């Protein structure tokens, strides 16, 4: 009864072609309707192929718009490009001017950093005296800032690096004066040594003064108080030989989201002394989608999770991972991995015997060359690894799923104007704020005398050039939001499938139930 | 010759 | 005849499930087909829930593209960071050097601004002499620029502020020389005093010279001609104590759309004297959609409608509204509301009696403190109000529906080069253009002598540092257009509804007419 | 049998309305169903009108996303803003100080450029002596750089323009020292004369030093070694009178894609001497779609196809095309068209007779004025043509279909710091690198003496200001990709048509085959 | 003491 | 008068 059951189906069915094929009277009609059904089916299959290819490509939809929801004021990190304090530097210079032998200077000072510095330098003095004309580049590499950073306790370096009270003259945010010991947080950078991060404090203060729409500060950044030697002398720990930031004067300014670690060596802006820098912030917000549509992460694979995630940190720790894997040591210019901490710096030199303080023996020279080779290994890995897409993709570093970013307008003006307004600025710094009297203390008197001589009223036109002002403000209150979204949802897929199926063949799922009922009836044939 |  | 009319419907109907339910022979078949119909209906309802949620969320579609349609050249507003003219400043300084009592200087000059300035200062002289060591910050706040701006007629200040003929040395646009009295329009800013807006003039001129692809001008912006006092002296009206732009030397440059009001205090770029600044403009155009899809406005809610709309103006007038509401006075740093104009400035001091010119009485001191308190109220409101999302959203400030914006590349070069090219530049300024001879007039002779002494040939290497050059040009001719559009139109909604309805249940509106006809037949049962 | 065949159709058809219209028993029912069918058809037609309007508008879909695929390091082109070498300039100045007659100086030197320069200037000396007070602007226009560039062989100018060995002191990329003769490629610019393009070289080198994450170089850019004349003297070929870049000191830096021609006169950034400039690159990639959805081109219509396409080149050659069409001559400030090369420069002056070297005759003055008029024609066309949308659209200049672009952060620091770090920098330049000893050669000894005097140890604080450092690095490793795509494909059109057709009328193509079969049956009626 |  |  196959023909009879198919005829019963054709009598009561909603399919468009099958009843005409089954009930066809002419054989030509049957052929025509079979061809019509096959053409409709093939066209439907092709259109579904394209539709499902689009769906399983998992496209993304991106909107760019300005929104009124405000961002919090960004964290501002300021680093003086000079690593050490001016009085400490002058003391070191004068100490070498009275005795050029660093060994004899170990016990000449009660400052901890000076003793450590003299002891570290003394390990290299005979080598420098005997081989500076044969290996100048080696000694320039080894007397860099980063070797002292790697080999002296940062809590000892912090006693000689730039101090907050001697760096920030004035600070204003949201119409009130800053509380320096409350709002500035000190952190150590292997190249800049002491750096300070400002965290905004909203009005609760009675000190109603300053910029209302942003942050402004006056910074002592020049080096004009330092002694001018009549001939060139080696002062180790000051110059990062042939680094792109080496021997520069000014302030390094980093604008970054609040609870994030800054990386002043590879991000931020430069400000020269004697200038006023305006930073016009345009805030941005990027929202991203997960694995099938893209890649984004909410946490750093290498971190402990205390920081707010930034891709830069992940990439830097990936670089450190590969450096540690290849050279067997860590670079001071990158974070140390929170996994292991028994890893030594590549620039470590505690291996040096104390006899190298007295003799320029071949063993000391070989150790010097080995340290140079370790530095070269680290530098080679740093230069090569970021071009290697396999290694970089193996670290699973993906952009944050909800990222706040800033576009900064940058411009400069000569801050202390010649003439009367410069007089007013000088009186504000030294008459009202009384900048020098911060150093009228038993432990800082020498610096007090230095600043009293340098910043006297007569020499103001030249001496005020050592200051720089930063003016950081939000230019546009609205945030430019870039949001990812899935372009082709499952509902859109279902609707398009319905459209295609209605256009070509006219099937509905209730009609697929017709064919299922026919199949069960054939099972009962 | 360079001195310290 | 309910069963009979339903059977008649089932005999002639296009619905897929109802005829099978009605004509079901087995009770199991009836149950199966009722379940099929219910499943199809529920799935359709869920899919429609998602579809209608998407539609009534009113999404937006944004395209970013570069278009060849050109923008007009932007309006350029230049403000000298020095508010007063150099000769006027030197006259004031010398007048105080001969008699430090401002009261005796009221009748020493025929210049209107000098008389007004002396009269204003004389109201505070005994207080400053008796209390400068007790309240230095109060006197620094009260001798600021903005108090003179608030209390002296701007038409009198304009006689002493920087003049166009003494500010712009040369100007060139589109290959021809500018006509300064035709193309520059003066406007008054409470901090910068005189400012000038350049409006572009296309070729019609026979003065074929200068930059062809933009605007370039040479500006006298330095302060090196001002007297250098051997001790610090109070010159009121020059220094805006502890403002983020205070005591700065250079030019404030604002690039903004043609028929718009600039706000140099919170927008624009800085240029130092002695430098050449290159401004590479990349034009942008943003097109936005109205209430259901977003928010945008074509006019300022607080304005008279003469200006081309910018969101900055709306936000500033909202701030002024709240300041006037709370403190009962208006801030000079913000526009006065076109609604009421009888509102007094917060820095107004016409209340001061004339006896305060002779005695430092307690009443005068209390009035001084009251003025200080008004200033503090205004500053506190300015600092707090923009963080208050309720107040800011109550002002209905929305971004423009058709906005032109500019991204500006910024770079500097030391303009007057040492040596021969500097000689050529000096000869161009002083030999060909004859800058000094502009002042060889009966009303400006003193300034002529000053410039003749300062800008002599021997002192050119130092004196030329007081000039700055601006080079403003369009970097990319094509405009980056960001256009909003509605993502999910009603037609797209209808098509998706049709797809869903065809996929699940197979209903068309002609079939809904079947069910309507059945309903009327049941009314006729 | 029309009624009978239509009844047979109505007995076996899938259309929703036609069977109810045909088999209608009541005339009111027939009217109602005809109205239902007409309403459904009209609504379908309107919805299809909107759908097809959307499709044939050919919309675009744009996504903005960050991708990990890296870009190659960009090409960096550096131009010294001083066109000629310092020793050559001093020789010219001294030669004119000993004999102000350029004719007598033709045979005073064996340098080819000096002889050509003297011969070129001698053609104008009597005119300059007799008419400088009547036509100062004409002589300032004619003694510009571009006339010497247009009229002296560039292979002769290159002998006197800035040399690579005297311009680039040090260079570092990807952790190793640059090989200057291998990595720098010299090209000639009519205003800057000698310019150099750096092409990156990846590690293979054993010279492990310098920046690891970018490119850094120290450039001699100042003019402080040039003689200071006690009175202003005419030195032709140095000053581009009243150009926006004229008489400037520093470096012009252009960051552009690798295999592209830079255009330093209208793109790039400025760097002053004595400063360190940081260039933070954020790479972008734009992908575009062809004619129906947009416009983009993969090649320059005016070029030979050797260059990687940039829209700037197409627009500049369009400007040159119109200039050549109108004035009959080509501008040196724009590329010469690869079609014809027999086109003369507008600034050419080989027409000048040799008698003009001896007499200030009227013929020589008329020729001078004719050259001035040609220059004015070229300048007028340059200023006007880019505002003319018809002419610009006639050139078919479209943005590239796959474009790499860079957003550059710009900041400055005072590079040679006062004091000890400046001493270290000086020793690096002059003690280790031995910059002066490059010139200890028989053909360059005079420059050796000049630099030995100028850069001695005592004068270092002032002399080091003539150097500038560039620090060019990639700020964000991920590329911001903006990709165009077609918003409304043909498949999406088919699906939406199916949705509409199912919603309103319920037709499928198999049912259109019903109506086609009925039409053939009526042909067989 | 500061004078005007 | 300007000299070369
Ligand atoms: C700056 O802030 C600190 C707190 O962060 C202030 O020190 C506090 O002073 C109060 C009294 O006013 C004491 O009760 C707290 O114990 C102090 N805290 C600490 C940590 O010392 C300090 O007075 C503020 N300085 C200024 C100038 O306002
Ligand atoms: C998310 O990141 C992963 C990286 O693991 C991407 O997968 C890689 O894709 C590239 C092609 O772009 C292939 O060559 C690699 O073999 C893939 N790696 C693995 C482990 O599968 C993935 O394509 C990214 N997803 C999206 C949506 O961008
Ligand atoms: C600058 O433009 C003004 C007009 O904006 C010129 O002054 C006009 O000069 C014509 C004669 O050439 C007179 O008929 C008009 O009455 C003048 N108008 C005004 C408002 O004064 C002026 O000559 C131009 N200056 C230069 C140097 O070209
Ligand atoms: C357009 O702006 C109005 C502001 O009036 C928005 O309405 C507010 O929306 C927020 C949530 O974002 C609510 O908390 C407020 O209560 C709403 N205010 C009112 C008066 O309704 C509105 O959402 C905006 N529209 C779009 C499409 O962005
Ligand atoms: C800079 O690179 C050039 C090549 O670009 C080097 O010159 C080559 O030196 C090798 C020997 O080392 C010769 O075999 C080649 O014939 C040379 N080529 C050319 C074109 O001269 C040069 O030695 C490199 N300089 C430095 C300092 O490394
Ligand atoms: C691609 O460029 C062509 C330029 O030839 C555009 O065609 C012009 O369009 C404008 C309107 O925008 C008309 O005024 C011109 O008459 C058109 N010119 C020609 C020769 O047809 C075209 O519209 C562009 N296509 C896209 C998708 O942007
Ligand atoms: C890329 O990195 C992997 C893992 O560190 C290494 O095996 C591979 O050799 C590197 N590629 C090259 C070209 O060295
Ligand atoms: C510095 O401190 C001493 C006491 O140690 C005091 O006599 C002197 O007046 C102080 N100087 C200043 C400027 O505060
Ligand atoms: C001021 O200090 C400078 C150096 O800083 C010194 O040369 C000058 O003599 C001092 N003047 C007075 C009056 O102390
Ligand atoms: C925000 O502004 C409104 C209106 O001015 C005010 O009532 C409210 O108190 C403000 N918010 C706060 C936290 O003060
Ligand atoms: C200045 O004007 C006077 C006449 O008032 C004239 O004699 C003198 O030559 C002029 N000087 C210049 C430089 O124009
Ligand atoms: C030039 O002016 C300076 C000051 O501006 C002065 O010291 C010098 O003596 C003047 N020289 C001549 C020749 O007038
Ligand atoms: C625009 O250019 C065309 C072709 O060069 C020219 O015919 C037309 O006159 C120009 N437009 C104007 C306003 O001159
Ligand atoms: C310069 O070259 C000469 C030989 O021509 C040599 O005697 C002298 O030492 C060289 N000077 C330097 C600084 O290299
Ligand atoms: C150093 O050079 C300067 C000029 O460049 C000169 O004045 C000075 O006398 C020179 N000093 C020595 C020691 O040669």
**Structural domain containing residue A314:** 302-398
Note whether D510 and A505 are within 8 A (CB). yes
Q: Are strands C193-198 and C214-220 parallel, antiparallel or unpaired?
A: unpaired
**Residue D388 buriedness (CB in 10 A; 0-12 / 13-18 / 19+):** exposed
Note whether D218 and D172 are within 8 A (CB). no
Ligand nearest to the CA of A296: 2
Q: Measured between alpha carbons, how far is D50 from C491 in angstroms, rounded to an integer?
A: 7
Give yes or no: residues C35 and C84 share one domain: no
Q: Do the Cβ atoms of E3 and C132 come within 8 Å?
A: no
Phi, psi of A221 (to 5 degrees): -125, -10
CA distances from A452 to A166, A418, A434, A462 (A): 14, 21, 11, 14
The DSSP result for D163-191, as a single string, is: -STTTEEEEEETTEE--HHHHEEEEEETT
Q: Within chain E, how many helices (H) and strands (E) appear? A: 0, 0
The DSSP result for D368-384, as a single string, is: HHHHHHHHHHHHHHHHH
Residue D140, by phi and psi: left (phi above 0), alpha (psi -120 to 50) or beta? alpha
**Residue A93 buriedness (CB in 10 A; 0-12 / 13-18 / 19+):** middle
For residues D327-343, one letter each, b for 16 or more C-beta atoms within 10 angstroms of the residue's C-beta and e for the rest, the string is: bebbbbbbbeeeeeeee
DSSP class of D466: G
**H or E stretch including D279?**
strand D275-287
User: Which residue's alpha carbon is at the smallest distance from atom 7 of ligand 15?
Assistant: D459
Note whether A217 and A467 are within 8 A (CB). no
Is there a domain that residue D159 lies in?
A: yes
Q: Measured between alpha carbons, how far is C523 from C93 in angstroms, rounded to an integer?
A: 103
Give yes or no: residues A209 and A329 share one domain: no
Residue C162: count of CB within 10 angstroms of its CB = 28
Q: Measured between alpha carbons, how far is D200 from D183 in angstroms, rounded to an integer?
A: 7
Task: Extract the tokens encoding C513.
Answer: 């007419």
Task: Extract the tokens encoding C161.
Answer: 């502020």
Ligand 3: nearest atom to the Cα of C179: 1
- How far C418 CA lies from chain D's nearest CA (Å)? 5
Task: Extract the tokens encoding A431.
Answer: 């008459």
Give yes or no: residues A272 and A409 share one domain: yes
Give yes or no: residues C42 and C90 share one domain: no
Give yes or no: residues C83 and C157 share one domain: yes
**Mutation test of ligand 14: which of D440, D448, D455 has the most ligand atoms closer than 8 Å to its C-beta?**
D440
Inter-chain CB pairs, C–D, below 8 Å: 237
The DSSP result for A377-430, as a single string, is: HHHHHHHHHTT-HHHHHHTT---BSEEEEEEEEEEEEESS-TTHHHHHHHHIII
Q: Measured between alpha carbons, how far is D309 from D320 in angstroms, rounded to an integer?
A: 17
Give yes or no: residues D28 and D88 share one domain: no
Give yes or no: residues A31 and A138 share one domain: no
Is there a domain that residue A66 lies in?
A: no
Tell me the H-state helices in A57-168.
Answer: 86-98, 112-122, 125-131, 136-142, 145-151, 154-157
Q: Measured between alpha carbons, how far is D85 from D193 in angstroms, rounded to an integer?
A: 11
Name the nearest CA neighbour of A483 among A301, A286, A267: A286
Q: Measured between alpha carbons, how far is A428 from A413 in angstroms, rounded to an integer?
A: 19
Is there a domain that residue D417 lies in?
A: yes
Q: Measured between alpha carbons, how far is A126 from A103 in angstroms, rounded to an integer?
A: 10
What residue ranges line ligand 5, CB within 6 angstroms? Answer: D 179, 181-182
Q: Measured between alpha carbons, how far is A454 from C341 in angstroms, rounded to an integer?
A: 51
User: Which residue's alpha carbon is at the smallest distance from atom 18 of ligand 6?
Assistant: D393
Q: Measured between alpha carbons, how far is D87 from A289 in angstroms, rounded to an integer?
A: 62
Neighbouring chains of D at 3+ CB pairs within 8 Å? A, C, F
Phi, psi of A77 (to 5 degrees): -110, 125
Q: Measured between alpha carbons, how far is D244 from D191 in angstroms, rounded to an integer?
A: 12
C59 lines ligand 4 (CB under 6 A): no
Of A60, A243, A244, the CB nearest to D65: A60
Q: 């002059």: which residue's tokens?
A: D430
Task: Extract the tokens encoding D464.
Answer: 């080091």
Is there a domain that residue C368 lies in?
A: no
Ligand 1: nearest atom to the Cα of A180: 1
Q: Within chain A, how many helices (H) and strands (E) appear? A: 18, 13
**Partner residues linked to A413 by β-bridges:** A276
Q: What is the tally of structural domains in chain D?
A: 2
Interface mutation vs chain C, best among E1, E2, E4, most C CBs within 10 Å: E4
Q: Compare all CA atoms of chain C with the CA of D141 and give the residue at the minimum distance.
A: C209
Interface mutation vs chain A, best among D61, D212, D282, D465, most A CBs within 10 Å: D212
The DSSP result for D407-463, as a single string, is: EEEEEEEESS-TTHHHHHHHHIIIIIS-SGGGG-STTSHHHHHHHHHHT-STTHHHH
Angle between the A490-504 and D490-504 helix axes, to the nearest 10 degrees?
70
Give yes or no: residues D433 and D509 share one domain: no
Ligand nearest to the CA of A203: 10
Please give the distance of CA A492 from its chain centroid, rounded to a whole number. 40
Phi, psi of C503 (to 5 degrees): -65, -50
Contacts of C482 (CB under 8 A, 6+ apart): A64, C62, C63, C64, C284, C285, C286, C287
For residue A140, the CA-to-ligand 14 centroid distance in Å is 25
The DSSP result for A263-310, as a single string, is: -TTTSSEEE-TTEEEEEEEEEEEEE---TTT---BSS-TTS-S-SPP-
Domain of A261, CATH number, reads 2.60.470.10
Of D278, D409, D494, the CB nearest to A47: D494
Q: Measured between alpha carbons, how far is A496 from C99 in angstroms, rounded to an integer?
A: 90
Note whether A474 and D469 are within 8 A (CB). no
A454 lines ligand 9 (CB under 6 A): yes
**Partner residues linked to C60 by β-bridges:** C486
D393 lines ligand 6 (CB under 6 A): yes
Q: Measured between alpha carbons, how far is C352 from C330 in angstroms, rounded to an integer?
A: 19
Resolution in A: 2.5
**Residue C299 buriedness (CB in 10 A; 0-12 / 13-18 / 19+):** middle
The DSSP result for D92-132, as a single string, is: HHHHHHH---GGGGTTS---HHHHHHHHHHHTTHHHHHHHT
**Partner residues linked to C328 by β-bridges:** none
Contacts of C358 (CB under 8 A, 6+ apart): C103, C126
DSSP class of D470: E
Interrupted backbone of chain D, residues before each interruption (C–N > 2.5 Å): 204
Q: What angle do CA C267, C271, C274 make, to 5 degrees?
A: 170
Is there a domain that residue A70 lies in?
A: no
Q: Decide: helix, strand or coil at residue D489.
A: coil
Dihedral of CA atoms A229, A230, A236, A242 in degrees, nearest 10, equals 110
User: Which residue's alpha carbon is at the smallest distance from atom 11 of ligand 2?
Assistant: D69
How big is chain F, counted in residues? 4
**Three-state helix/strand/coil letters over A337-377:** CCCCCCCCECCCCCCCCHHHHCCCCHHHHHHHHHHHHHHHH
Give yes or no: residues A346 and A377 share one domain: yes
Of D210, D410, D510, the CB nearest to A16: D510
Q: Do the Cβ atoms of C233 and E1 come within 8 Å?
A: no
Phi, psi of D39 (to 5 degrees): -65, -45
D440 lines ligand 14 (CB under 6 A): yes
How big is chain D, counted in residues? 525
Of C100, C121, C236, the CB nearest to E3: C100
Q: What angle do CA C345, C91, C193 make, to 5 degrees?
A: 30
Give yes or no: residues C152 and C195 share one domain: yes
Q: Do the Cβ atoms of A65 and C484 come within 8 Å?
A: yes
Angle between the C27-56 and A509-523 helix axes, to the nearest 10 degrees?
160
Judged by a CB distance cut-off of 8 A, whether residue C230 touches chain E is no
Residue A1: count of CB within 10 angstroms of its CB = 10
Experimental technique, in short, is cryo-EM
Collect contacts of C384-391 with beta carbons under 8 A, ≥24 apart: C384/A174, C384/A175, C384/A203, C385/C318, C385/C319, C385/C322, C385/C323, C386/A213, C386/A477, C386/C315, C386/C319, C387/A70, C387/A202, C389/A68, C389/A69, C389/A70, C391/C318, C391/C322
Q: Compare all CA atoms of chain D with the CA of F2 and give the residue at the minimum distance.
A: D233
Rg (CA), chain A: 36
- How far C280 CA lies from chain D's nearest CA (Å)? 8
Task: Extract the tokens encoding C356.
Answer: 């305060």
Name the nearest CA neighbour of D217 among D196, D186, D248: D196
Q: Decide: helix, strand or coil at residue D338.
A: coil
Q: What angle do CA A93, A99, A104 make, to 5 degrees?
A: 110
Is there a domain that residue D365 lies in?
A: no
Name the nearest CA neighbour of C277 among C98, C471, C61, C74: C471
Phi, psi of A218 (to 5 degrees): -110, 125
Give yes or no: residues C166 and C140 share one domain: yes
DSSP class of A76: E
CA distances from C143 to A476, C353, D246 (A): 31, 18, 42
DSSP class of C429: I
Angle between the D490-504 and A27-56 helix axes, to the nearest 10 degrees?
120
Q: Measured between alpha carbons, how far is D29 from C518 in angstroms, rounded to an integer?
A: 12
Q: 């001699």: which residue's tokens?
A: D220
**H or E stretch including D4?**
helix D2-11
Contacts of F4 in chain D (CB under 8 A): 96, 100-102, 121, 125, 128, 233-236
Of A62, A473, A510, the CB nearest to C36: A510
Instruction: Give A282's Cβ-side CA count (13 Å radius).
Output: 10
Of A212, A473, A502, the CB nearest to C379: A212
Q: 């009534």: which residue's tokens?
A: C56
User: Which residue's alpha carbon is at the smallest distance from atom 14 of ligand 8?
Assistant: A437
**Partner residues linked to D76 by β-bridges:** D198, D255
Q: Measured between alpha carbons, how far is D78 from D69 in angstroms, rounded to an integer?
A: 28
Note whether C255 and C74 are within 8 A (CB). yes
Residue A268, by phi and psi: left (phi above 0), alpha (psi -120 to 50) or beta? left
Q: Measured between alpha carbons, how far is D284 from A79 in angstroms, rounded to an integer?
A: 30
Name the nearest CA neighbour of D160 among D179, D184, D188, D181: D188
**Partner residues linked to A197 by β-bridges:** A77, A185
Contacts of A286 in chain D (CB under 8 A): 66
The DSSP result for A45-59, as a single string, is: HHHHHHHHHHHHT--
Task: Extract the tokens encoding D11.
Answer: 């007995």
**Mutation test of ligand 13: which of D321, D380, D385, D391 has the most ligand atoms closer than 8 Å to its C-beta?**
D391
**Residue C55 buriedness (CB in 10 A; 0-12 / 13-18 / 19+):** middle
Give yes or no: residues A115 and A223 share one domain: yes
A456 lines ligand 9 (CB under 6 A): yes
Q: Measured between alpha carbons, how far is C344 from A105 in angstroms, rounded to an integer?
A: 69
Contacts of C108 (CB under 8 A, 6+ apart): C95, C99, C114, C118
Q: Measured between alpha carbons, how far is A401 from C55 in angstroms, rounded to an integer?
A: 26
Q: Measured between alpha carbons, how far is C4 from A232 in angstroms, rounded to an integer?
A: 116
Instruction: Give A360's Cβ-side CA count (13 Å radius).
Output: 9
Task: Extract the tokens encoding D180.
Answer: 């200057």
Contacts of C257 (CB under 8 A, 6+ apart): C74, C75, C308, C310, C404
Note whether A78 and A196 are within 8 A (CB). yes
Contacts of F2 in chain D (CB under 8 A): 132, 232-234
User: Which residue's alpha carbon is at the smallest distance from atom 11 of ligand 7?
Assistant: A388
User: Which residue's alpha carbon is at the smallest distance from atom 4 of ligand 2?
Assistant: A393
D295 lines ligand 6 (CB under 6 A): yes
Task: Extract the tokens encoding C463.
Answer: 């004196």
Task: Extract the tokens encoding C108.
Answer: 């020493």
Q: Are strands C467-474 and C214-220 parallel, antiparallel or unpaired?
A: antiparallel
**H or E stretch including D521?**
helix D509-523
Q: Decide: helix, strand or coil at residue A118.
A: helix
- Asked whether the CA dihedral D31, D32, D34, D38 is positive or negative, the reply is positive
CA distances from C163 to C112, C181, C252, D139 (A): 16, 11, 15, 32
Is there a domain that residue C145 lies in?
A: yes
Contacts of C55 (CB under 8 A, 6+ apart): C488, C490, C493
Note whether D380 and C210 are within 8 A (CB). no
Contacts of E2 in chain C (CB under 8 A): 132, 232-234
What residue ranges line ligand 10, CB within 6 angstroms? Answer: C 322, 388, 390-391
**Residue D58 buriedness (CB in 10 A; 0-12 / 13-18 / 19+):** middle
Q: Compare all CA atoms of chain B with the CA of A134 and give the residue at the minimum distance.
A: B1
User: Which residue's alpha carbon is at the smallest distance from atom 5 of ligand 13?
Assistant: D391
Q: Decide: helix, strand or coil at residue D280.
A: strand
User: Which residue's alpha carbon is at the smallest distance from atom 2 of ligand 14?
Assistant: D440
Is there a domain that residue A67 lies in?
A: no
């Amino acid at each position: 009864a196959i023909r009879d059951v198919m005829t019963k189906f054709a009598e009561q069915t909603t399919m468009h072609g099958v009843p005409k094929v089954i009930n066809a009277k002419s054989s030509m009609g049957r052929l025509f309707w079979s061809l019509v059904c096959l053409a409709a089916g093939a066209m439907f299959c092709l259109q579904m192929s394209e539709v499902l290819q689009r769906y399983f490509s998992y496209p993304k939809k991106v909107t760019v718009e300005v929104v009124p929801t405000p961002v919090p004021f960004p964290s501002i990190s300021i680093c003086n490009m000079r690593n050490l304090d001016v009085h400490i530097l002058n003391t070191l210079n004068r100490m070498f001017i009275e005795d050029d032998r660093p060994f004899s200077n170990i016990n000449k000072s009660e400052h901890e950093f000076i003793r450590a510095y003299m002891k570290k330098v003394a390990k290299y003095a005979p080598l420098f005296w005997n081989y500076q004309d044969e290996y100048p580049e080696v000694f320039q590499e080894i007397f860099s800032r980063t070797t002292f950073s790697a080999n002296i306790d940062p809590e000892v370096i912090a006693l000689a690096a730039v101090q907050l009270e001697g760096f920030v003259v004035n600070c204003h945010y949201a119409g009130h004066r800053c509380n320096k010991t409350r709002d500035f947080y000190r952190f150590f950078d292997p190249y800049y040594f002491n750096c300070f991060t400002y965290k905004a404090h909203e009005p609760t203060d009675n000190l109603s003064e300053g910029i209302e729409n942003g942050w402004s500060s006056i910074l002592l950044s020049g080096s004009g108080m330092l002694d001018k030697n009549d001939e060139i002398r080696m002062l180790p720990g000051l110059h990062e030989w042939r680094s792109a930031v080496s021997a520069s004067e000014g302030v390094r300014v980093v604008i970054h989201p609040p609870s994030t670690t800054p990386y002043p060596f590879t991000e931020g802006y430069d400000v020269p002394p004697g200038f006023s820098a305006s930073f016009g912030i345009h805030p941005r917000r990027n929202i991203r989608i997960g694995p099938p549509h893209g890649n984004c992460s909410d946490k750093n694979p290498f971190g402990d999770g205390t920081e707010r995630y930034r891709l830069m940190a992940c990439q830097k720790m990936c670089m450190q991972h590969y450096i540690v894997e290849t050279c067997g040591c860590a670079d001071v210019g990158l974070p140390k991995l929170p996994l292991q901490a028994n890893i030594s710096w590549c620039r470590d030199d505690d291996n040096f015997p104390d006899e190298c303080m007295f003799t320029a023996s071949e063993e000391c020279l070989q150790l010097l060359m080995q340290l140079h080779n370790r530095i070269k290994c680290a530098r080679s890995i740093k230069s090569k690894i970021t071009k290697n897409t396999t290694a970089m993709e193996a670290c699973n570093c993906f952009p944050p799923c909800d990222e706040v970013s800033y576009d900064v307008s940058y411009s400069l003006s000569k801050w202390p104007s010649a003439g009367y307004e410069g007089d007013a600025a000088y009186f504000d710094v030294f008459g009202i704020e009384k900048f020098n009297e911060r150093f009228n203390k038993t432990g800082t008197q020498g610096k007090y005398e230095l600043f009293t001589k340098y910043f006297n009223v007569s020499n103001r036109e030249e001496s005020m050039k050592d200051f720089a002002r930063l003016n950081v403000y939000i230019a546009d209150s609205n945030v430019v939001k870039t949001q990812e979204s899935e372009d082709y949802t499952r509902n859109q897929l279902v609707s398009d499938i319905g459209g295609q199926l209605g256009l070509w063949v006219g099937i509905s799922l209730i009609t697929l139930a017709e064919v299922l009922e026919l199949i069960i009836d054939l099972f009962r044939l | 010759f360079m001195r310290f």
